[PDB]
Amino acid sequence: VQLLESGGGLVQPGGSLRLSCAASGYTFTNYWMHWVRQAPGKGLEWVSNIDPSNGGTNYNEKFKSRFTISRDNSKNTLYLQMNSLRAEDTAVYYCASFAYWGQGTLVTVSSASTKGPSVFPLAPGTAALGCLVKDYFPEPVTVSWNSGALTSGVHTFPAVLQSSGLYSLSSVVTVPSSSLGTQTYICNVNHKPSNTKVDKKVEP
Amino acid sequence: YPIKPEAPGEDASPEELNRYYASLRHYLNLVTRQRY
Amino acid sequence: DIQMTQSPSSLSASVGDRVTITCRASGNIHNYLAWYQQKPGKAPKFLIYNAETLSDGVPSRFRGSGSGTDFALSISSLQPEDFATYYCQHFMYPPFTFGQGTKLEIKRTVAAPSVFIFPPSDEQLKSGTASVVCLLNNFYPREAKVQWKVDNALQSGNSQESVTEQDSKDSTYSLSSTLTLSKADYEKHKVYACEVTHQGLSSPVTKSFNRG
């Protein structure tokens, strides 16, 4: 049994997105199907549900003017048609039915243009060093140390949304101070939305 | 809303009654789980 | 609308502990309550429904009780995989609202931050902006205050911070504070200081540098 989600991504304010959720492994009319969302760093928020046995719908009245839930019993698919999207609708959207949850899909609503990060050194018994991954859009980015090798002492912070509408985060690592002249520390930054990989050695 | 299975009659085999027990449990699962 | 009030909002506990989270509905929901567990960067997992029924594969150490407005989730003996965020949700009449969540974290002893300060890079200054970074590394508990001073003047409105999740290994938090200035405001000042306040320090700690 799986719910598999599709259709998220980046949209400008006043724009439209359709999310879909494909169910498999059981009779599609067995359970109500729900949409739930979660803004970054916040709680779960219930959006709407449909009964595929008869098309009965409930909506969070907050979304009633803009969002339409539907399904197609001949495709085992649930839909959420989101119109007139706003920045405040930025969230991971989940489908859920009984014990089955979709993986979630990030919907970003912003005027900002897709843009890869500028990467900068945070130069150094214990020394701290890292990389400042600045002014990318949208989320997410991944950071590793030493094409994946440096796991110990690594802290990769949650991104902050700057007033500019671009994201920024820092990744840091603590190492022996007496290993700064000898060992090589490199930060690998992947930003899939701009097709961007920066590698930077952080030298003292 | 799921379809209620009919109880067998007086002359049912143990096979039919045990199959009914499973169909009844499936029905009641669908009834109690539906809203989630 | 029926609202769900969850308590506590956070709980520090240990492997082996018995713990209880409560959920109170503002109206009668009969037994139409679900409990979820969520870990960072993962979808919620459905644990319990109809207030007390365990979902398939959920360990027996999870139990739910309740009816009407008063509900509770109990874990008889916490295991390492149980540190997570928990939510309740009602299915009585729409909207099917969630509790605001309980964060269940690992208790350890007070640990003071190691504080580090990072000047802007030459590269970045080239671009016309300066980011000064202050790192508070491996502290507990999570509560900490960072204040920025530029030539000994308290800064406000020009810093952003974030905090990591509790570390698997030592159960500590780390915190990045980023001060942002123009290349030109940066070059008008000599002393850049990060002042850290935390339970595990006798006196506030300052790390600072002189531009160049």
Short mmCIF file of all heavy atoms in Angstrom, two decimals, chain B residues 25 28-36, chain C residues 31-34 46 49-51 91-92:
data_model
loop_
_atom_site.label_atom_id
_atom_site.label_comp_id
_atom_site.label_asym_id
_atom_site.label_seq_id
_atom_site.Cartn_x
_atom_site.Cartn_y
_atom_site.Cartn_z
N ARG B 25 -15.47 -8.86 9.85
CA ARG B 25 -14.32 -8.11 10.43
C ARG B 25 -13.85 -7.06 9.40
O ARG B 25 -13.55 -5.92 9.81
CB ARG B 25 -13.21 -9.07 10.87
CG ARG B 25 -12.20 -8.43 11.81
CD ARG B 25 -10.81 -9.06 11.85
NE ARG B 25 -9.85 -8.04 12.30
CZ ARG B 25 -8.75 -7.60 11.65
NH1 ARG B 25 -8.38 -8.11 10.49
NH2 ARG B 25 -8.02 -6.65 12.20
N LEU B 28 -16.46 -4.15 9.28
CA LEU B 28 -16.34 -3.30 10.49
C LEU B 28 -15.04 -2.51 10.47
O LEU B 28 -15.07 -1.34 10.91
CB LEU B 28 -16.45 -4.15 11.76
CG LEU B 28 -17.82 -4.78 11.93
CD1 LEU B 28 -17.79 -5.76 13.10
CD2 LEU B 28 -18.91 -3.73 12.10
N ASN B 29 -13.97 -3.07 9.92
CA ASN B 29 -12.71 -2.29 9.77
C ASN B 29 -13.00 -1.09 8.86
O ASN B 29 -12.58 0.04 9.20
CB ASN B 29 -11.54 -3.10 9.22
CG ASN B 29 -11.02 -4.12 10.20
OD1 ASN B 29 -11.20 -3.98 11.41
ND2 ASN B 29 -10.37 -5.15 9.68
N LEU B 30 -13.69 -1.30 7.75
CA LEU B 30 -13.97 -0.22 6.77
C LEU B 30 -14.88 0.81 7.43
O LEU B 30 -14.63 1.99 7.30
CB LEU B 30 -14.59 -0.81 5.50
CG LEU B 30 -13.63 -1.60 4.62
CD1 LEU B 30 -14.30 -2.03 3.33
CD2 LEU B 30 -12.37 -0.80 4.33
N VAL B 31 -15.86 0.36 8.20
CA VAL B 31 -16.79 1.28 8.90
C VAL B 31 -15.93 2.12 9.84
O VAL B 31 -16.03 3.34 9.76
CB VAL B 31 -17.92 0.53 9.64
CG1 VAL B 31 -18.66 1.48 10.58
CG2 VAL B 31 -18.86 -0.14 8.65
N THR B 32 -15.09 1.51 10.66
CA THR B 32 -14.43 2.29 11.75
C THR B 32 -13.27 3.11 11.20
O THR B 32 -12.90 4.07 11.87
CB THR B 32 -13.99 1.41 12.91
OG1 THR B 32 -13.02 0.43 12.49
CG2 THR B 32 -15.17 0.73 13.54
N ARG B 33 -12.69 2.72 10.06
CA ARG B 33 -11.50 3.43 9.53
C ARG B 33 -11.86 4.54 8.54
O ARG B 33 -10.96 5.34 8.22
CB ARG B 33 -10.60 2.41 8.83
CG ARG B 33 -10.00 1.45 9.84
CD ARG B 33 -9.31 0.31 9.08
NE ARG B 33 -8.79 -0.65 10.02
CZ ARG B 33 -8.06 -1.72 9.70
NH1 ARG B 33 -7.73 -1.96 8.45
NH2 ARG B 33 -7.62 -2.52 10.65
N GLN B 34 -13.06 4.50 7.97
CA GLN B 34 -13.42 5.31 6.77
C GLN B 34 -13.04 6.80 6.93
O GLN B 34 -12.45 7.36 6.01
CB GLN B 34 -14.90 5.25 6.48
CG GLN B 34 -15.22 5.86 5.11
CD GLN B 34 -16.70 5.86 4.78
OE1 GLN B 34 -17.53 5.91 5.69
NE2 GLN B 34 -17.03 5.86 3.49
N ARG B 35 -13.42 7.45 8.03
CA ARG B 35 -13.26 8.92 8.17
C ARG B 35 -11.77 9.30 8.14
O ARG B 35 -11.47 10.43 7.72
CB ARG B 35 -13.92 9.41 9.46
CG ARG B 35 -13.22 8.91 10.71
CD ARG B 35 -13.99 9.33 11.95
NE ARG B 35 -15.30 8.72 12.14
CZ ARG B 35 -16.47 9.37 12.16
NH1 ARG B 35 -16.57 10.68 12.00
NH2 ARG B 35 -17.57 8.67 12.40
N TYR B 36 -10.85 8.42 8.55
CA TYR B 36 -9.38 8.73 8.54
C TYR B 36 -8.87 8.75 7.10
O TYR B 36 -7.76 9.29 6.93
CB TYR B 36 -8.63 7.76 9.44
CG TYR B 36 -9.18 7.78 10.86
CD1 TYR B 36 -10.10 6.84 11.28
CD2 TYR B 36 -8.85 8.81 11.73
CE1 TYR B 36 -10.63 6.88 12.56
CE2 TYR B 36 -9.42 8.90 12.98
CZ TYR B 36 -10.30 7.92 13.41
OH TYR B 36 -10.84 7.98 14.66
N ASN C 31 -14.88 9.33 20.05
CA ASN C 31 -13.51 8.74 20.04
C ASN C 31 -12.80 8.98 18.69
O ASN C 31 -11.84 8.24 18.36
CB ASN C 31 -13.56 7.26 20.38
CG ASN C 31 -14.23 6.46 19.30
OD1 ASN C 31 -14.91 7.03 18.45
ND2 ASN C 31 -14.05 5.14 19.34
N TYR C 32 -13.15 10.04 17.97
CA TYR C 32 -12.61 10.29 16.62
C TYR C 32 -11.32 11.10 16.74
O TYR C 32 -11.32 12.28 16.33
CB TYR C 32 -13.65 10.99 15.76
CG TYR C 32 -14.95 10.25 15.64
CD1 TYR C 32 -16.15 10.93 15.72
CD2 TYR C 32 -15.00 8.88 15.44
CE1 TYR C 32 -17.36 10.29 15.56
CE2 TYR C 32 -16.21 8.22 15.29
CZ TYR C 32 -17.39 8.93 15.34
OH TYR C 32 -18.58 8.31 15.22
N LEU C 33 -10.28 10.46 17.26
CA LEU C 33 -8.94 11.07 17.45
C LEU C 33 -7.85 10.14 16.92
O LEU C 33 -7.88 8.96 17.23
CB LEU C 33 -8.71 11.33 18.93
CG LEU C 33 -7.46 12.18 19.15
CD1 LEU C 33 -7.77 13.63 18.88
CD2 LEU C 33 -6.86 12.00 20.52
N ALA C 34 -6.91 10.70 16.20
CA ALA C 34 -5.68 10.03 15.72
C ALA C 34 -4.47 10.68 16.41
O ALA C 34 -4.49 11.89 16.70
CB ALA C 34 -5.59 10.12 14.23
N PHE C 46 1.14 7.53 11.14
CA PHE C 46 -0.15 7.28 11.82
C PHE C 46 0.06 6.22 12.91
O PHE C 46 0.47 5.11 12.57
CB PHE C 46 -1.15 6.91 10.72
CG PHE C 46 -2.58 6.72 11.08
CD1 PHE C 46 -3.43 7.82 11.19
CD2 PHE C 46 -3.14 5.47 11.14
CE1 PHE C 46 -4.79 7.66 11.38
CE2 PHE C 46 -4.52 5.31 11.30
CZ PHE C 46 -5.33 6.42 11.42
N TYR C 49 -5.63 5.38 16.11
CA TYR C 49 -6.90 5.99 15.65
C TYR C 49 -8.04 5.49 16.50
O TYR C 49 -7.86 4.51 17.30
CB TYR C 49 -7.13 5.69 14.18
CG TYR C 49 -7.33 4.23 13.90
CD1 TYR C 49 -8.60 3.73 13.70
CD2 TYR C 49 -6.26 3.38 13.77
CE1 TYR C 49 -8.80 2.40 13.37
CE2 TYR C 49 -6.43 2.04 13.46
CZ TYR C 49 -7.71 1.56 13.23
OH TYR C 49 -7.92 0.24 12.94
N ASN C 50 -9.17 6.18 16.38
CA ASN C 50 -10.35 5.99 17.27
C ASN C 50 -9.89 6.04 18.72
O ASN C 50 -10.41 5.26 19.56
CB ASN C 50 -11.12 4.72 16.93
CG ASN C 50 -11.85 4.85 15.61
OD1 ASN C 50 -12.30 5.95 15.22
ND2 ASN C 50 -11.97 3.73 14.92
N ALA C 51 -8.97 6.96 19.00
CA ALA C 51 -8.43 7.26 20.34
C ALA C 51 -7.49 6.18 20.91
O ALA C 51 -6.57 6.58 21.68
CB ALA C 51 -9.58 7.48 21.28
N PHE C 91 -11.42 13.94 14.01
CA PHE C 91 -12.21 13.64 12.80
C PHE C 91 -13.71 13.70 13.13
O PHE C 91 -14.47 12.87 12.61
CB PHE C 91 -11.79 12.28 12.25
CG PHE C 91 -10.40 12.25 11.70
CD1 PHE C 91 -9.30 12.24 12.53
CD2 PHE C 91 -10.19 12.33 10.33
CE1 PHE C 91 -8.02 12.25 12.00
CE2 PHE C 91 -8.91 12.34 9.81
CZ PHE C 91 -7.83 12.29 10.63
N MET C 92 -14.14 14.68 13.92
CA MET C 92 -15.56 14.74 14.40
C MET C 92 -16.37 15.47 13.32
O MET C 92 -17.14 14.81 12.63
CB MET C 92 -15.65 15.45 15.76
CG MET C 92 -17.06 15.72 16.25
SD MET C 92 -17.97 14.22 16.46
CE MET C 92 -19.50 14.94 17.09
#
